[PDB]
Amino acid sequence: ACLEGCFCPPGLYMDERGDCVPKAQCPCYYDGEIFQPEDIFSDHHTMCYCEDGFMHCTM
Amino acid sequence: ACLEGCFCPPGLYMDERGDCVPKAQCPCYYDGEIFQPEDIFSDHHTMCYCEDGFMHCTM
Amino acid sequence: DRDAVCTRSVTVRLPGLHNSLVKLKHGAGVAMDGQDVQLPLLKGDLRIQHTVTASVRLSYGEDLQMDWDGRGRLLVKLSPVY
Amino acid sequence: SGKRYPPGTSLSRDCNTCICRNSQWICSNEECPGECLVTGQSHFKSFDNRYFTFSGICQYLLARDCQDHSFSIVIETVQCADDRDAVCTRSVTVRLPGLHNSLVKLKHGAGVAMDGQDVQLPLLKGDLRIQHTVTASVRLSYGEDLQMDWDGRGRLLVKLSPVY
Numbered sequence A, B: 001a002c003l004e005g006c007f008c009p010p011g012l013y014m015d016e017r018g019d020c021v022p023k024a025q026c027p028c029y030y031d032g033e034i035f036q037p038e039d040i041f042s043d044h045h046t047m048c049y050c051e052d053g054f055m056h057c058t059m
Numbered sequence C: 001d002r003d004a005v006c007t008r009s010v011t012v013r014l015p016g017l018h019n020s021l022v023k024l025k026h027g028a029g030v031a032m033d034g035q036d037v038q039l040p041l042l043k044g045d046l047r048i049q050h051t052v053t054a055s056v057r058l059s060y061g062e063d064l065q066m067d068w069d070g071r072g073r074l075l076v077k078l079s080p081v082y
Numbered sequence D: 001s002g003k004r005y006p007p008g009t010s011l012s013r014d015c016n017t018c019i020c021r022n023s024q025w026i027c028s029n030e031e032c033p034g035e036c037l038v039t040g041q042s043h044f045k046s047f048d049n050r051y052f053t054f055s056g057i058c059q060y061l062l063a064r065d066c067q068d069h070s071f072s073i074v075i076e077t078v079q080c081a082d083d084r085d086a087v088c089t090r091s092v093t094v095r096l097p098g099l100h101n102s103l104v105k106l107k108h109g110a111g112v113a114m115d116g117q118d119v120q121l122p123l124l125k126g127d128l129r130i131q132h133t134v135t136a137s138v139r140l141s142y143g144e145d146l147q148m149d150w151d152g153r154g155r156l157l158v159k160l161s162p163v164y
Helices: none
Strands: A028-030 A033-035 A039-041 A047-050 A055-058 B028-030 B033-035 B039-041 B047-050 B055-058 C010-012 C022-024 C030-032 C046-050 C056-060 D010-012 D017-021 D024-027 D037-039 D043-045 D051-053 D061-064 D072-079 D087-095 D104-106 D112-114 D128-132 D138-142
Touching (some): A028 A055, B028 B055, D104 D138
Antiparallel strands (some): A028 A033, C010 C022, C022 C030, D010 D017, D087 D104, D128 D138
């Protein structure tokens, strides 16, 4: 719905530590795993990184 | 041990929200339950409150 | 006062999954089977996540909701199947 | 180490103590806990204070109780940069046959997942305690004869008491 509470402006997204942050350093939660904003990351066979809050995997 | 990291001065104790606070509003975790700093609280038979971070129960 | 009786906690019981036992704690805390648990809690049916980051919300399937029993404002949502 | 000490003194290593008597340090030989370390990209340390590197990408067996089966640890390794010589840890899986034959997973955040379930810290079950250390690093503690360390960005450590 259109709920009521404490938000912060749309340029800012909520971080775990009570602050909210722009999406630049907004970590990724791939598999739940809290990847830092720049994490290059891959098996032999997959290839994955965290860009901006989204986790870009490939194969 | 004598560990290394981010602390805050001894007058301040760590709160869940990334800030650390004096012990006045430092909640209680009785049974795990996160009681606000002033919570009067009791069955018929027990009698319990949260003072300053400690939960004072009686009977 | 003797005329002041508020909620501490509520216990929920799902025979459909493990015959488990969920406990909603006077914080925003939850405890499943004695174990404290991070939010979100995607198990198969029931989802338990914060709402405003100051209030818990259980969601069993689609026919059930809950609300924060921290300071005792418990609510439910029962769909007309019941 | 190139410096003098009077006789009778008792300097102490981390493992035990040694005392100067007639220009000869006397020493105990009593055991003391070892540490297998993972860090960097692929730099390993043995219990017996070996160093090496093995940039393999698979679910390798880090450690295990091998005469009985009190536990077993399994690293999972991944390439970790554009370079082929950059293989860092993603996650580690721990397995406790002593409790439920459960399966703990340490996640590249500070996150943990037991049996697929994400879990708040602390996690007092009967034996194993899992809580943050600096609020930026997880620490498992099974009983008294076992520790762990954060496998978030891949700096896994252990503490095995001399019972093993």
